Structure formats: structure tokens, C-alpha cells
Amino acid sequence: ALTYRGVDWSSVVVEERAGVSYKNTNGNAQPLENILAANGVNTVRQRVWVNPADGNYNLDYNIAIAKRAKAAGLGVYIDFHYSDTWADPAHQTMPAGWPSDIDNLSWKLYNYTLDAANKLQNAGIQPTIVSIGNEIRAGLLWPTGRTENWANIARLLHSAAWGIKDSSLSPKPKIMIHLDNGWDWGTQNWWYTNVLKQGTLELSDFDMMGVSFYPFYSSSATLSALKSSLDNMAKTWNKEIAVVETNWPISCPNPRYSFPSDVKNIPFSPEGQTTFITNVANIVSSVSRGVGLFYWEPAWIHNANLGSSCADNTMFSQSGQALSSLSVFQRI
């Protein structure tokens, strides 16, 4: 049913360079991209940073792994953070060297996006999806695009979108706007309504609405709330929808927040991951134009808790072997 069955495998080269040797469920060594493909994955998400000091996740880093994904028959979803480091609702740090005034920043954002798009094209990489920003619920490129400067945000997003549209990418990618807390209809509605009413960024400027959906940052993240929120988003703007980030723990000794009521019966184990992922996938599929699901960093074994309060959210053993839960992508 789902058009996109994927995972964010951004850390792949970082882990291989750290000595990780990935193995299939049979226990035999095999390139990660091939393991993913063999398990049903058809798309990989990758975070792109502007000028990270150590080079990890910069454009060259992404082109190299995108080529590998392409060779494994996997489509590529480019996630522009528009920052030199992690971009999230609490951090949208201006890339070093970029101007702060809206006129010039908008132009810089356009140039950067256009440039990156053309470089991807020249490398033979045509991403199927491109998000202009990562979880920009509180805006982007702070403080210039910090909420509530809806006028600046809409303008910046318009420039980013057209940087892609004016590029040489062929075929062109679907343009996505990504917000966190997919279950929170109030915030989704508040954000899109205020951004779209500015008159610069138009509905026709983008194609997809992506949301993050995690069970360990609030008990309000129920499957029912996700369903209702996505249904509302679909009926209001009728754009393709996708859960672009999600996790389920195989181990969670002491959570910082209570888990959502409709998932408390799901065990912390590979079997549990299979159940949770399949259920989230089917919630998306039950939504008008719900087309994708992406698990976040299933193979980052050296960062098992993946920034959450739960101990282990990966889908691979500490020795680098794919767990039984990875084949879930063959059934959604």
C-alpha cells in the first residue's frame, strides 16, 4: 500500500568508519544498502548539513552514500536541515557565513538549494523526495525565520522550493515540508494556516507534508491522535502525507515520559517493533494520500538510544546484525 517504505540511514558511513560490519539476518556480512533492500526498504532518507566542520552529512558525504543507495535500487529522500548541525524545533542554527537580513538570507537559501540540487543532478542523483528544512515547527534559520515571523518563514520556504524547481534535477523531486509531533493537530493546523496566509508560499509550491511520530516524548502521541491529525491535514490541504521519522524500542528501562495508552501493550522487543511499525504504517495508509513511513536510524548501533530516554531503538544487534524486525518493510 505505502509508496515509500524507508529508513534514515544517514549514519551509515560514520558507523562503517567506526568499525561496524553490517550483517544480514542470516548472519553474513553484506553492505547495509543491500540488507535494507533485501528487507523491503525502497527509499532511504539522508540528512544534509551545510558546512559541518568534520564533514559528516555534508553534500559530498550524501552524494557518496546516495550513489550506493542508487546502486542498490533504493530511492533517495534528501532532508535539508539548512544548518551546519542538527536542526529541530529547539535548534535552527544559521549556517556559518549566511546573512541574517531576510532579503539576502532568502537569496542565499535559494542559491544554496539550487546549487545543491544541480550538484546532485550532476552526480546522477535525482531524489524522489526533498524536504526544505527538518522539523521546522518553530521556523528555520533563526532568528530570521523563527516563529512567529510567518512572513519571513513563508518567504524563505518559497525561495527554497523554487531553488529546487529552477534546478536541473530531472525528474524533479517531490517537495516536502516537515513538522514534528504529527499527532498534534492543533500545532499542525496553526503552523500551516499562518504560513500559507502570507501569500508568498502557495499550496502549489510544495507536494508533501511530513511528520515525525515518536512514542516516548509524550503520552499524547497515541495512534488515534495520529490518525485524527493526519485525516485533518489530508482533508484541509489534500497533500501527500508521510511519517518521516519514527522509532520503537527493543529496550526502554526508564522512560522520561509515560507511553501512549494505545501502545502500552506492545512489548519492547523486535516483535514489538514489527507490531508498532506495521500499525503506524497502516494508520498512514488509512489516510487520504498517506504514502510513506520512514524509521529513523535503525542501524546506528553506537547511538542506540537515538537521542531518546529509551535505551535501544535500533533494529540491528550490537554486533551489526539486522534483527528480525527489519523484514517488516516487506509487509507494509
- The catalytic residues are 135, 245
Place of cell 510513506: 292
> What stretches of the chain adopt beta strand conformation (E)?
4-8, 43-48, 75-80, 129-132, 139-140, 145-146, 174-179, 208-212, 240-245, 290-296
Select from 104, 122, 286, 330 the one that contacts ligand NAG (CB under 6 A).
104
Stretch that binds ligand NAG, among 29-37, 44-52, 71-79, 107-115 (CB under 6 A): 107-115
| Closest CB to ligand NAG among residues 104, 288 | 104
Q: Which is nearer to ligand NAG, 2 or 169 (CB)?
A: 169
Binding residue (CB under 6 A) for ligand NAG from 64, 107, 256, 319: 107
Name 310's Cβ contacts closer than 8 Å, sequence gap at least 6.
216, 247, 249, 251, 252, 255, 268
Q: How far is the CB of 99 from ligand NAG (least distance, A)?
A: 6
Binding mask 109-138 for ligand NAG (x = CB under 6 A): --x---------------------------
Stretch that binds ligand NAG, among 10-18, 106-114, 188-196, 215-223 (CB under 6 A): 106-114
Q: Are 78 and 46 in contact (CB under 8 A)?
A: yes
Smallest gap from Cβ 235 to ligand NAG, in A, equals 39
CA distance 56 to 18: 13
Give the relative orientation of helices 223-237 and 185-196 as an angle to the nearest 10 degrees.
Answer: 20
Does 108 sit near ligand NAG (CB under 6 A)?
Answer: yes
Q: Which is nearer to ligand NAG, 84 or 312 (CB)?
A: 84
Helix (H) or strand (E) holding 154: helix 150-165
**Are the beta carbons of 312 and 270 closer than 8 angstroms?**
no
Q: Note whether 109 and 160 are within 8 A (CB).
A: yes
Binding mask 55-94 for ligand NAG (x = CB under 6 A): ----------------------------------------
Give the footprint of ligand NAG on this chain (CB under 6 A).
Answer: 104, 107-108, 111
